[PDB]
């Protein structure tokens, strides 16, 4: 068995990334039903709503699903209590220390996966007792690592650094890229952007449609002095860029960033003032599609990509 398939009890080594405003039970349960692992994105859910999405996912699928928890989540104790009482099969943690919750989640029966952006942090997660890690490259949508290491340079270094399974994230929007990730030595892939634009994603339809119109170079890893974030170059980004060019302080950039822009953009469709988080691979997606269409494409595309490789060079 592929190491991730066996670890998580899934048919295909494809995980849908936990994404604020996108990863409702509808997206997560559809990915799980298609044989991958769908993740609910707790980052955008108050505890009561999180519990509802877990229950709805549980009703909609008999297959494993998980919850992604950014560790800066403001009511952590409440959502951890929920996640352990609901026996969530897989928990994916990011943006914080894996030492805090890993042993407790594992004692409660969850498999634990932590998101990292370097070999050094991959090693610290392995030492913390996680079951696997996601190594996320520069091209990924949303908050990314300060080192700016791309998927192609990150994966071989991370898989040489640890003995536990490694999931590649950042730039995986096709069967070819799934093959490239397994060629580099990852056991599986985590797909964000392509699933964020799927029919089942909870993102606003105006957000999805706007993302489909974007072209190469429309995203930029930005706000680096506050927290590097990859987003579409919209009006909000332009304000940030003008501020950075004038030598704005961290406090000025923080004031401009303000609060709630990701919700306003991704969930509510404010394409001017929103923080439009999306990966570089957005430029590959041109029309609406369902989770099942994407899953079939990633699986069948992998097969064709691999079959067309020369036996040697």
Ligand X SMILES: NC(=O)C1=CN([C@@H]2O[C@H](COP(=O)(O)OP(=O)(O)OC[C@H]3O[C@@H](n4cnc5c(N)ncnc54)[C@H](OP(=O)(O)O)[C@@H]3O)[C@@H](O)[C@H]2O)C=CC1
Q: Kindly list the distances between the CA atom of residue 232 and the CA atoms of 8, 207, 220, 260, 280, in Å, as whole numbers in the listed order.
A: 33, 11, 7, 16, 9
The answer to the question of whether 18 is labelled as a binding residue is yes
After which residues are there C–N gaps above 2.5 Å in the chain? none
With CB under 5 to 8 Å by kind, the binding choice for 254 among a copy of itself, ligand X, Na ion, none is none
Under rule CB under 6 A, residue 141 binds ligand FMN:
yes
DSSP string, 181-234: HHHTT-SEEEE-HHHHTSTTS-S-HHHHHHHHH--TT-EEEE-TTT--EEEE--
Q: According to the binding rule CB under 6 A, does residue 55 interact with ligand X?
A: no
- Residues in 197-226 at the binding interface with ligand X, rule: CB under 6 A: 202
Q: Considering the rule CB under 8 A, would residue 139 count as an interface residue with a copy of itself?
A: yes
Cβ at position 78, least distance to ligand FMN in Å:
17
Instruction: Give Cβ neighbours of residue 303 (< 8 Å, ≥ 6 apart).
Output: 175
Q: Which one of residues 77, 213, 251, 308 is an interface residue with a copy of itself (CB under 8 A)?
A: 308
Q: In terms of CB distance, is 22 or 172 closer to ligand X?
A: 22
Q: Percentages helix, strand, coil for the chain, rounded to the nearest 5?
A: 45, 15, 40
Annotate each residue in 249-288 with x if it binds ligand X (CB under 6 A) or - if it does not, as one string: ----------xx-xx-------------------------
Q: Which residue is nearest to Na ion (CB)?
A: 142
Contacted entry of ligand X, a copy of itself, Na ion, none for residue 144, CB cut-off 5 to 8 Å set by kind: Na ion
Closest CA to 168 of 210, 140, 196: 140
Per partner kind, with CB cut-offs from 5 to 8 A, the member of a copy of itself, ligand FMN, ligand X, none near residue 165 is none
- Residue 101 annotated as lining a ligand binding site: no
- Burial environment of residue 124 by CB neighbours within 10 A (0 to 12, 13 to 18, 19 or more): middle
| Shortest distance (Å) from residue 241 CB to a copy of itself | 11
Closer CB to Na ion, residue 286 or residue 311? 286
Q: Which residues bind Na ion (CB under 5 A)?
A: 140, 142, 144, 159, 212, 286
């Amino acid at each position: 068995m592929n190491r991730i398939c066996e670890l998580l009890g899934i048919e295909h080594p494809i995980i849908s990334g936990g994404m604020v405003w996108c990863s409702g039970w509808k997206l997560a349960s559809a990915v799980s039903n298609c044989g991958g692992l769908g993740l609910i994105g707790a980052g955008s859910m108050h505890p009561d709503n999180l519990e509802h999405h877990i229950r709805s996912c549980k009703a909609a699928t008999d297959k494993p699903f998980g919850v992604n928890v950014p560790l800066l989540y403001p009511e952590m104790d409440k959502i951890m209590e929920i996640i352990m009482r609901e026996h969530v099969p897989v928990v994916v943690t990011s943006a914080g220390s894996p030492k805090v919750w890993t042993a407790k989640l594992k004692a409660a029966g969850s498999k634990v996966i932590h998101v990292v952006s370097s070999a050094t942090f991959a090693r610290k997660s392995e030492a913390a007792g996680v079951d696997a890690i996601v190594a996320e490259g520069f091209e990924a949508g949303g908050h990314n690592g300060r080192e700016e290491t791309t998927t192609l340079c990150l994966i071989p270094e991370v898989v040489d650094a640890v003995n536990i399974p490694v999931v590649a994230a950042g730039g995986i929007a096709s069967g070819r890229a799934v093959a490239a990730a397994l060629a580099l030595g990852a056991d599986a892939v985590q797909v964000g952007t392509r699933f964020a634009l799927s029919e089942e994603s909870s993102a606003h339809e105006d957000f999805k449609a706007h993302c489909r119109r974007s072209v190469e170079g429309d995203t930029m890893l930005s706000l680096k002095a506050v927290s590097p974030t990859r987003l579409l170059k919209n009006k909000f980004y332009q304000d940030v860029f003008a501020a950075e060019q004038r030598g704005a302080s961290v406090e000025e950039l923080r004031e401009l960033l303000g609060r709630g822009r990701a919700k306003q953009g991704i969930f509510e469709g404010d394409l001017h003032e929103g923080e439009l988080e999306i990966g570089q691979a957005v430029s590959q997606i041109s029309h609406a599609e369902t989770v099942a269409e994407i899953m079939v494409d990633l699986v069948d595309g992998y097969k064709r990509s691999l079959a067309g490789m020369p036996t040697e060079i």
